[PDB]
């Protein structure tokens, strides 16, 4: 395995890999980490480009994935992709795809032109229909995964998985000092626990002698490093290597 790897550079024909979304005022990170990596993998293993609907995952999976805007289970999300499939759907107000995200973007622990994010947000309804004007039908727009698995808490195995199959979904414990991240390799030193947070791991590298994971957050582009961040790799820091999940799309 190489010393560094950036899925964005390795798969130039898959622009979703470079995208950063906004989960809005809803605890749907579990769904976002999933549909983002799934979008990347559909492109990587089908060379078609599809903006997988965070809305479809968030609203229609149900108990198998947890509790919607109240938090969920990453592995459960990939299971939904293999069982019921996922339709397309872009950003809020984009009118792209079958079911675009219905929760407005907001400012995540930063100042900006958007309204500040609020912790309170309700899970939208599971509507098995597409926006007006879009074709095909909801049922016909479903993209299925043909496998859903969990990668071991093993740095090398995680790197190998990304290297061969593309970005994966992961999760780590968020402490308040992470909220103000701007650059460099994040290492937890202070702050109260904020809870678990699912994200998308798309690579790795070494900065100033510190090994790290290249991660895409779902708090828009004005948070962190253009929406991305780097976190210590190899020590299961904040549990970053303890909940890796992925899967492969059907042919
Ligand atoms: C992940 C989530 O969306 N968390 C919030 C966010 O704004 O990103 C806060 C609470 C984290 C600082 O409740 C979601 C989940 O499914 O967590 C378990 C992985």
Spatial separation of the C-alpha atoms in residues 86 and 52, rounded to whole Å: 7
Domain count, the chain: 1
- For ligand 1, atom 5, the nearest C-alpha belongs to 27
Does residue 193 have its Cβ closer than 6 Å to ligand 1?
Answer: no
Spatial separation of the C-alpha atoms in residues 197 and 216, rounded to whole Å: 12
3-state SS class at 34? helix
Q: Which atom of ligand 1 is nearest to the CA of 72?
A: 16
Least Cα distance to 214 among 230, 198, 227, 200 occurs for: 230
Helices (H) and strands (E) in the chain, counts: 6, 8
How much distance in Å is there from the Cα of 136 to the middle of ligand 1? 32
State the sign of the Cα–Cα–Cα–Cα dihedral 208, 7, 214, 163: negative
Dihedral (Cα; 190, 193, 195, 199), 10-degree rounding: 0
Helices of type H across 14-53: 29-44
Centroid of chain to Cα 15: 14
Question: Residue 159: is it exposed, middle or buried by C-beta count within 10 angstroms (0-12/13-18/19+)?
Answer: buried
The range of the structural domain enclosing residue 47 comes to: 1-251
Centroid of chain to Cα 94: 19
Q: Residue 197 catalytic?
A: yes
How much distance in Å is there from the Cα of 118 to the middle of ligand 1? 13
Spatial separation of the C-alpha atoms in residues 174 and 193, rounded to whole Å: 6
Give the CATH number for residue 146: 3.90.70.10
How much distance in Å is there from the Cα of 142 to the middle of ligand 1? 26
Distances (CA, A) of 215 to 87, 122, 201, 223: 25, 27, 5, 13
Q: Residue 153 catalytic?
A: no
Token pair, residue 183, equals 């650059």
Resolution in A: 1.9
């Amino acid at each position: 395995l190489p010393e560094s790897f950036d899925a964005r550079e390795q798969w130039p024909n898959c622009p979703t890999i470079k995208e950063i979304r906004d989960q809005g005022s809803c605890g749907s990170c579990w769904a976002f980490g999933a549909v983002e990596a799934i979008s990347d993998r559909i492109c990587i293993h089908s060379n078609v480009n599809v903006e997988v609907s965070a809305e479809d995952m968030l609203t229609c999976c149900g108990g198998e994935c947890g509790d919607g805007c109240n938090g969920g289970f990453p592995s459960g999300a990939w299971n939904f992709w293999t069982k019921k499939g996922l339709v397309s759907g872009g950003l809020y107000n984009s009118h792209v795809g079958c079911r675009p995200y219905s929760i407005p973007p907001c400012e995540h622990h930063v100042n900006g032109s958007r309204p500040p994010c609020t912790g309170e947000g309700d899970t939208p309804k599971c509507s098995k229909t597409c926006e007006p004007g879009y074709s095909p039908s909801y049922k016909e727009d479903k993209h299925f995964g043909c496998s859903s698995y969990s990668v071991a808490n093993n740095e090398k195995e995680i790197m190998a998985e990304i290297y061969k199959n593309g970005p994966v979904e992961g999760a780590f414990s968020v402490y308040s000092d992470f909220l103000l991240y701007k650059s460099g390799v994040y290492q937890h030193v202070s702050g109260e626990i904020m809870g678990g947070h699912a994200i998308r791991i798309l690579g790795w590298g070494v900065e100033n002698g510190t090994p790290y994971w290249l991660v895409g957050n779902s708090w828009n582009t004005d948070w962190g490093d253009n929406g991305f961040f780097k976190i210590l790799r190899g020590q299961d820091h904040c549990g970053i290597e303890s909940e890796i999940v992925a899967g492969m799309p059907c042919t």
